[PDB]
Design a protein that fits this description.
The complex is a heterotrimer of chains A (216), B (213) and C (228). With 216 residues, chain A is mostly beta strands. Chain A is 2% helix and 49% strand. Classes of the chains: A mainly beta (216), B mainly beta (213), C mainly beta (228). Chain B: This is Ig-like domain-containing protein.
Chain lengths: 216, 213, 228
């Protein structure tokens, strides 16, 4: 099966450069070119350009002419996007998309451009209670506070608990650090019986926190 | 170089309605129009490609029409899981061009939120900050007001809200409001309450806790 | 052939006309003394009719001493070719007897080394295929020199959208192209047979639809087996 695996999230200061990778598998790399697509936070898709994987020729959309360079490494079936003289406005998810056949995309790479430094989150429980009960339904969660930059991933019981899960979009606090909450609604009867752990990953700081949430 | 104008910017329709989205190109592109769907927090998915070809595995309720400059995407019987932003893409020649997108939302019956309040954790207190969380769960429409009251005194400038995207199964939203105080300020007060105003609630609902109790 | 010119008569002694009921259907290429290579879909299009191969021709209608019409002893389509695909579109035809060789009839050495023709290489395609969209059939052999188009460009969604495998190649089509009736004919790069014009419902002369050629080198073992 076709797969496109992109490199992890990045944090870079203004003026710096970044090189994002897109590793292809399950098909002959040089038989299909690669498109690069940008999505700034809460904005639309922008087609950046194409790289011909066979000849190395590139076509850039007008808005991406200058600081953006596509390149290859055919021996490891990988396409790269390099961005130079990084601006705060370059903060976006960058996707690679295989051009032609059954449509395939990479998972995206979020690049944040800021003078601020990396910070792992602190994970506090949002304990279930008597007034945190919807009759015979209870609510519990985790508060993923004070981290930079985006993104964070939150799962419940190693991805075994998905129903009723609401992971809120992160909000930037006055401190210039992000904070979010991930909640889940479960049967009140299950509180004593079932164990509830929130799995928090913050790749930019290699933070991996598992937090048990229990009635206080 | 080729330009694309997508409309509308956003729409709300009910389950079973027909949704129609337009894309107009600056120049004649024959039938080289594509349509992508991007669900909240997900990677874009190609639904229709050149010649209004429905991609295998995509429900037959999605169809494309048009040739030349004027293209249309039709969702014939809108389902809850179709909530997304849709983007056309012209692929006549390089560079390709996406449209500005159309946010498709579902209009459903009014649903009052379930309200929950969470005091700060003892662990967070040890650090010198208190975060009080008010949760508004599974409500429709998106418009809701959350007011924080500390010992019946109205709060301002010390809270932040975050709302989820419309749920793909029940078409509701959820909201979290976070009241942030110093440990010192937090311990200096007793009653912590969040007052919730929404269309599905006959009167504003308050969820409260007494610090320590 | 679209946007070409009349070929010099007998300058391509390998050029065969694959006929059905005495009428030109496809191009073909003499690869051995008794073997003509063409495209699998031509056999489908022939069906009921008498399949014959015309060698030593320039004009299809005007008689000449170099012209010789051969009966086909055996029609060998590639076992993996299907009517709803363009893959493995090869066909080998055994003539009733070994062809009489001379200035106007000579087999062409075909590519054995499985290495892609470099993009931009000018290759020559010849045929008695249509010369206008109106469907005009030339009486005399036509040819055109086409630049090879890389596979990645050819697989862009605008073009062939991933259908071009490693066993296939493309050439530029904008206003110059191989057309209906050219299928089965040769694509020759620097004196070597590299491709066979692939059958299909492709419109000709459109830049959005590059010409498609099956790479002979990919089928070297299958060609060797049938030719022995
Ligand atoms: Zn097309
Ligand atoms: Zn037109
Ligand atoms: Zn829900
Ligand atoms: Zn046919």
């Amino acid at each position: 099966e076709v797969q496109l695996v992109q490199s992890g999230p990045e944090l870079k200061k203004p003026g710096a450069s970044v090189k994002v990778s897109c590793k292809a598998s399950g098909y002959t790399f040089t038989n299909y070119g690669m498109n690069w697509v940008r999505q700034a936070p809460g904005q639309g898709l922008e087609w950046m350009g194409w790289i011909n994987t066979y000849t190395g020729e590139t076509t850039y959309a007008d808005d991406f002419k200058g600081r953006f360079v596509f390149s290859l490494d055919t021996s490891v079936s990988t396409a790269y996007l390099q961005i130079s003289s990084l601006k705060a406005e370059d903060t976006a998810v960058y996707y690679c998309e295989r051009e032609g056949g059954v449509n395939n995309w990479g998972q995206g790479t979020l690049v944040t451009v800021s003078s601020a430094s990396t910070k792992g989150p602190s994970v506090f429980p949002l304990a279930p209670s008597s007034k945190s009960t919807s009759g015979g339904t209870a609510a519990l969660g985790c508060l993923v506070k004070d981290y930079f930059p985006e993104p964070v991933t939150v799962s419940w019981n190693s991805g075994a608990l998905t129903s009723g899960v609401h992971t809120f979009p992160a909000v930037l606090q006055s401190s210039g650090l992000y904070s979010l909450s991930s909640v889940v609604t479960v049967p009140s009867s299950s509180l004593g019986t079932q164990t509830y752990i929130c799995n928090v990953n913050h790749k930019p700081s290699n933070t991996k926190v598992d937090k048990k949430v229990e009635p206080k | 170089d080729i330009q694309v104008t997508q409309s509308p910017s956003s729409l709300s329709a009910s389950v079973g309605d027909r949704v129609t989205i337009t894309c107009i190109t600056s120049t004649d592109i024959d039938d080289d129009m594509n349509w992508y769907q991007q669900k909240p927090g997900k990677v874009p998915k190609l639904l229709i490609s050149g010649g209004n070809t429905l991609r295998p595995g995509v429900p037959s309720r999605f169809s494309g029409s048009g040739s030349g400059t004027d293209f249309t995407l039709t969702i014939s019987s809108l389902q809850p899981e179709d909530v997304a932003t849709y983007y056309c893409l012209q692929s006549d020649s390089l560079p390709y061009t996406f449209g500005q997108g159309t946010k498709v939302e579902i209009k459903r019956t009014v649903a009052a939120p379930s309200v929950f309040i969470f005091p700060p954790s003892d662990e967070q207190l040890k650090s010198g900050t208190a975060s009080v969380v008010c949760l508004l769960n599974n409500f429709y429409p998106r418009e809701a007001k959350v007011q924080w009251k500390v010992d019946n005194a109205l709060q301002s400038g010390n809270s932040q809200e975050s709302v989820t995207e419309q749920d793909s199964k029940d078409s509701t939203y959820s909201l979290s409001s976070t009241l942030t105080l110093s440990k010192a300020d937090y311990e200096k007060h007793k009653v912590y309450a969040c007052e919730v105003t929404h269309q599905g609630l006959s009167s504003p609902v308050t969820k409260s806790f007494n610090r320590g109790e | 052939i679209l946007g070409g010119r009349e070929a010099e008569a007998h300058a391509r002694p390998y050029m065969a006309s694959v006929q059905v009921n005495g009428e030109h259907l496809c191009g073909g290429v003499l690869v051995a003394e008794q073997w003509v290579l063409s495209a699998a879909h031509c056999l489908e299009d022939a069906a009921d009719g008498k399949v014959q191969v015309l060698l030593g021709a320039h004009s299809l209608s005007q008689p000449e001493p170099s012209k010789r019409l051969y009966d086909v002893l055996r029609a060998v389509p590639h076992p993996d070719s299907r009517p709803d695909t363009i893959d493995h579109d090869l066909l080998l035809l055994q003539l009733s007897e070994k062809a009489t060789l001379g200035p106007a009839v000579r087999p062409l050495p075909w590519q054995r080394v499985d290495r892609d023709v470099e993009p931009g290489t000018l290759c020559d395609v010849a045929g008695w295929g249509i010369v206008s969209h109106a469907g005009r059939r030339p009486d005399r052999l036509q040819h055109v020199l086409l630049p090879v188009l890389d596979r990645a460009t050819c697989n862009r969604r605008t073009h062939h959208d991933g259908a071009i495998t490693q066993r296939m190649m493309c050439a530029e089509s904008n206003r110059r192209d191989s057309c209906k009736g050219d299928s089965g004919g040769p694509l020759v790069c620097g004196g070597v047979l590299e491709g066979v014009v692939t059958s299909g419902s492709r419109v000709c002369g459109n830049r959005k639809k590059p010409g498609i050629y099956t790479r002979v080198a990919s089928y070297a073992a299958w060609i060797d087996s049938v030719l022995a």
